Amino acid sequence: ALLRILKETEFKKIKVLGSGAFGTVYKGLWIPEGEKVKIPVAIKELREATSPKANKEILDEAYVMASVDNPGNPHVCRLLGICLTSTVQLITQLMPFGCLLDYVREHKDNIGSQYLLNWCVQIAKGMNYLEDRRLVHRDLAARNVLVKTPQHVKITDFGLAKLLGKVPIKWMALESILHRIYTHQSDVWSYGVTVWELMTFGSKPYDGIPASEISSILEKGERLPQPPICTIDVYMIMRKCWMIDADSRPKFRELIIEFSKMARDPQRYLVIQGDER
Numbered sequence: 001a002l003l004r005i006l007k008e009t010e011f012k013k014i015k016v017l018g019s020g021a022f023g024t025v026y027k028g029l030w031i032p033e034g035e036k037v038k039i040p041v042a043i044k045e046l047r048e049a050t051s052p053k054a055n056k057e058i059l060d061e062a063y064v065m066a067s068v069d070n071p072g073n074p075h076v077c078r079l080l081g082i083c084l085t086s087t088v089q090l091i092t093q094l095m096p097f098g099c100l101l102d103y104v105r106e107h108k109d110n111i112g113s114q115y116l117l118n119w120c121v122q123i124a125k126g127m128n129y130l131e132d133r134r135l136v137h138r139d140l141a142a143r144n145v146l147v148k149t150p151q152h153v154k155i156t157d158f159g160l161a162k163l164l165g166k167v168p169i170k171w172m173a174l175e176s177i178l179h180r181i182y183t184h185q186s187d188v189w190s191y192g193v194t195v196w197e198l199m200t201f202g203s204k205p206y207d208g209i210p211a212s213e214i215s216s217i218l219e220k221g222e223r224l225p226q227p228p229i230c231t232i233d234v235y236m237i238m239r240k241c242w243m244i245d246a247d248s249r250p251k252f253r254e255l256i257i258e259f260s261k262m263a264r265d266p267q268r269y270l271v272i273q274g275d276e277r
């Protein structure tokens with residue numbers, strides 16, 4: 001609804017936060033047009049000439065990403081603006097703790113059951129909000145969940161796949177791998193893989209198995225193994241996210257209720273060394 005087109009003089013890039021095939025993420029500073037205030041931002045500069053869309057069609061996709069701020073949800077990121085030159089530059093408020101994937105890997109022996117279950121609730125609340133806005137994410141993963149504070153996570157990169165036109169096979173539902181079908185139920189599958197990443201403290205799903213063999217392995221009934229800290233109650237919820245029939249998978253609304261019940265008594269559902277305080 002409110003997409004701000006930023007001029008290159010309004011914002012400055014200070015340092016690189018991370019790189020990749022997608023492009024680069026910078027920690028920067030923004031001074032809005034009719035304002036006298038410095039705002040700490042994160043700038044995602046995408047790789048030039050990847051997408052065949054003209055600047056007008058790129059703007060339409062960015063408008064949709066910006067519309068998500070209305071009415072809004074605390075667990076979904078906010079696109080502050082877009083800068084279109086030879087590359088696409090996306091601007092958001094800086095999340096100082098980075099993504100949830102790096103956070104759980106770096107803080108493994110200090111994360112208790114209360115944290116893991118509350119993050120699952122928060123991710124389902126943000127995903128359920130995107131489903132309310134009729135928006136399919138297409139790339140939900142622990143790398144796409146940002147940490148504002150350890151007790152407040154937000155989903156990022158929604159609509160970024162549609163803007164662009166390595167495929168994340170190990171997070172995709174079987175119907176997305178075989179037919180490129182993307183729905184809110186295929187996002188439920190990716191949510192299950194994201195919960196599995198958190199419960200394993202950042203383990204790589206199907207490690208060693210080539211991406212070309214994932215579809216046949218799923219057709220044989222093989223799923224991600226039960227993480228050591230999970231009880232059968234938690235594992236059964238991730239297992240239901242990985243059903244062949246998309247309509248039989250739980251809804252984000254139901255996942256909020258299930259994980260919310262577990263977060264009320266977390267030591268009963270997750271067994272972690274260090275929670276015996």
Ligand SMILES: *CCC(=O)N1Cc2nc(-c3cc(-c4cnn(C(F)F)c4C)c(F)cc3F)n(-c3ccncn3)c2C1
Nearest residue numbers: 042043044065077079090091092094095099156157158
């Ligand atoms: C493990 C950390 C990691 O992998 N990061 C990747 C990443 N992306 C961003 C990021 C994302 C966006 C963006 C793209 N699409 N939308 C929205 F949904 F429409 C957004 C908000 C962006 F505009 C800038 C951007 F930097 N970050 C990041 C890093 C720090 N603070 C915020 N975002 C990361 C980290």
